[PDB]
Predict the 3D structure of the following.
Amino acid sequence: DLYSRYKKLQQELEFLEVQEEYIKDEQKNLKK
Amino acid sequence: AVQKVVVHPLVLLSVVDHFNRIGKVGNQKRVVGVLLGSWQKKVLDVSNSFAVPFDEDDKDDSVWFLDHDYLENMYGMFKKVNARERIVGWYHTGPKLHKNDIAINELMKRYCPNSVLVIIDVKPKDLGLPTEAYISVEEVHDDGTPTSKTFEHVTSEIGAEEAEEVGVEHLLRDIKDTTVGTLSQRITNQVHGLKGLNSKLLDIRSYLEKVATGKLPINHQIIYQLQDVFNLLPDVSLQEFVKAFYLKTNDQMVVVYLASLIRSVVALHNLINNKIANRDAEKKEG
Amino acid sequence: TRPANHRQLTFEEIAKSAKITVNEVELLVMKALSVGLVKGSIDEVDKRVHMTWVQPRVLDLQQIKGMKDRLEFWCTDVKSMEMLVEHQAHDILT
Amino acid sequence: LDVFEKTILESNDVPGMLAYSLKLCMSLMQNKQFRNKVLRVLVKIYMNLEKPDFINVCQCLIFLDDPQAVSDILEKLVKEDNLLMAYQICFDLYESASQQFLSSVIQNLRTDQTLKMIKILSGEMAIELHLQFLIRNNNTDLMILKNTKDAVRNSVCHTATVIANSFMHCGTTSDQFLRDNLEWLARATNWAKFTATASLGVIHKGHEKEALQLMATYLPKDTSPGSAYQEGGGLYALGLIHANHGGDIIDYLLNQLKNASNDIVRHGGSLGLGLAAMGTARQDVYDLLKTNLYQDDAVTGEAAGLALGLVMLGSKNAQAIEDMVGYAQETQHEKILRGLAVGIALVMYGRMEEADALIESLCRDKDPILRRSGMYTVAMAYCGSGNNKAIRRLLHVAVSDVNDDVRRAAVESLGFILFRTPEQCPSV
Amino acid sequence: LRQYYLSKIEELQLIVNDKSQNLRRLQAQRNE
Amino acid sequence: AVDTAEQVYISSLALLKMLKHGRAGVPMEVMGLMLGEFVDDYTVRVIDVFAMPQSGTGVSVEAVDPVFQAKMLDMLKQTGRPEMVVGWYHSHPGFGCWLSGVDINTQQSFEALSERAVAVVVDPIQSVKGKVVIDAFRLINANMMVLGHEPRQTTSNLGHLNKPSIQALIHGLNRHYYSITINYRKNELEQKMLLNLHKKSWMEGLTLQDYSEHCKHNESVVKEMLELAKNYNKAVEEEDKMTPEQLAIKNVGKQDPKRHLEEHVDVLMTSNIVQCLAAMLDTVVFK
């Protein structure tokens, strides 16, 4: 199951960036 | 003369619907209307505007029709409404100044002794501020022509009143505005100034290389009026100028450095306050 | 004639070019400063007349080509340094 | 691949030790070229093995989209004379594959097998089996309907409760709790009578036995009531009967609207035409309903736009997209644009990168209705394969938008991108 | 060989853990 | 025979003229007639508005000789768009944004000419910079209460997108009439015109203010920042051990450290880095 362990880790790593990109847009616009 | 002119946003928004009215053909429809304002000082303000008809051909720049009767009728009508405003001039929606407009100004100068005109870009595809303004003077030249009437520039800006500002701010809800955020919109102002300077220098280069290479007569003025531009632009590689420039750059950098130093300890104060008030609270809660 | 790099002119070239004497130069440039075509000043210790401004004159085609070349030299750097401010600031200027 | 085929053919367990390779190569995958490159070497090991299992090749083939491969295996299967393993993929293709793929492989597999070709083509017996299961194994309740009978208003609760009743009896062909009273079904002023007439369509889902004579009690040319909206809802219900079954019904609706009338009946007829021909790309449907679009009426825009988006479902033809995008800018109405947004969104059906430029040419446009069309196109062009490019644009361009009008349909576009793996969708 | 395929997911799990720790601060600021 | 999910379009000039004429007669009610068309049976568009001479009392405002109105609507046919008089508006300064007893009196007269007659109530007092209070009302029959006024075939004009107020619900609201939802239509000619009336040309962007006033301004800000930080020292070092829940209650007086520091950081940095950046731009652009 080590292949599934690697790709799910690679999945969440590149998916945590879209959360960290979308929040910085939302926190910037919520000031305005 | 007239120093400068102020345009309220009711005008230059009434103009664009006039262009939408009978600008269905949209080829050479020079829409002309008549301004309304009050010269309360040497400075001038305009607030209202209305419509006059106009038809002219693509060639034959002498055939045109300013309606006298519509002007007098709707002036009496708006006087029956508003007794404060008097006519000041006209606007035409041509992107550039035309050749037959001075005949229009000389015709309408009976109603107003100093009839200004406002060029309004209906489709400002070039970046910048619309609604430039011109007035008629005498430019007696040494060439041999006695006099002509070829206008000159007057400074203009869009002003505001305490009710129309509410409307133009509420209608600006389809655009994000970063004007409240500082240290960003000044940089966009610098970028806009650089682009405007590039566009003006490109126009000057285009005209100069057009008259330079055979086409068009060499105008004996401008070429020595623009000679004094190049007598400016002082030497950046001058010793005392650099010696003063670093002397002031360091004086600014002192304030910037002290601002960073006075910011860092406030950040640290917030950090240790959050850590202490968090850890003691979790000591209580656990 | 000189292209504003060394606009300062010595008195020796003034007296050689205008074939006037040594001590009669200064009143002459004062006469220029009397009228308004020339907007300079005179330093007597080094005996050099600094230059600030010269009234414009008529120009011909080759001078117009040189002016267009200098104007293009000025026109390129505006775009070249607007690329500097726009390229190194993306999310500030947005 | 190179050594991957040798490794998968290296001596191991021919059950799921070598069948999990397909699933863990299809669930996680970068692109489309390498997916087909790894998928083309699975039909080999599933075929040249001594025991080629026939039923687990369709899911390989539908991503492969090869008519010659399914033609080859059915040609090798017809002369084998094994009907136990022969119809089963011809029901699998109906159960999963697209209608265009089926109708583009019948003439390959047709140029015994006659009833089998009818089985893959029509699915009348499959629809009949589903209908018989629904009518025999039926446990509908009516007491909760009597509980909802208390709610009285001129609003939905007595006028659009018929649609709420229809979901409980969707496909069951038993409207006995609807024809219990007739005084209950007269409370609306010419707009919920459209729903009351349309509700007969969802009761008799897949009722090819009950033809036009089922709704001949309520037809435009049979009874002719004082309200023509009953007649308009009849054609809408008839179109709702034959979902993706454009046979005789599509011809009857094609010549029904040929001599059509005022736009109330044309609304129902056009909706029936759009629903009964989806993914068929028939030219006659297209230009007959394009005349509807060019009729320039703000009641026909939702009538024509959804239909012209439905008939060209994912066809991505240039004529439809550069006709309707161009038309959706100059009409000064609201119902035309509102019905055109989902229609021009439906011309994309998951083309990934192939639907990029249109989105970049529309999501930037000043029309808010076109912005919501753009968000529906982002929702449809990257459906299933949830990638961070589409998610990032979808959750950026309207979470901080100046207009509220698109933002309610902004994150609603999220749920079509993450249905493959809903494990982490509530977390974000 | 195989322990390479362990250590790679060790580094990826460290990156995932660090980013998931960093995201909660921005989540708190957005909530406030 | 059905009032559907209606909508009213208003143009930009109509709203600007609306607010200007409402403000210009601030203490009393001003008048006006609307110019527009019925684009469809669903929606009604207003493209222009204009005002008339009036005659106002303390509680009422009447019209004047209507040969003005007839001749004005005759003359406006000649230049450009020949629309009709689709509605009328007035103002209600400081009031509940509602139809009064005499406001609803003339609505019957306006509705007797054409069925789709819309009243518009604006108010320039409660309107603020970010939002103008505006409402449009449609008179309903007071004889028919037992039936439905609008069937609401969809959920556009409902608790969706807007909520009925309280003061409108007192003087009338869903009684004797109803409200309709306003949206703004913007054509591209005015769309790409409205977003650019704040900028200046290139002399404003490239201009150093002065260096003497800049040095004196920085001197003044640093000089007050000295005493402000001296107060900040005592503010931090006191910090009486008693939970800010009351330290925000002894802060409500004249106390000001920890709050004016970062503002001075902002006004120092955003006025120094901009000036230095513009100095570099000026010194190497022109050459």
The first helix of chain F runs from residue 12 to 24. Strands of chain F lie at 7-10, 33-37, 43-50, 55-56, 61-62, 84-91, 118-122, 134-139, 177-180, 182-184. Residues 7-195 of chain F form one domain.
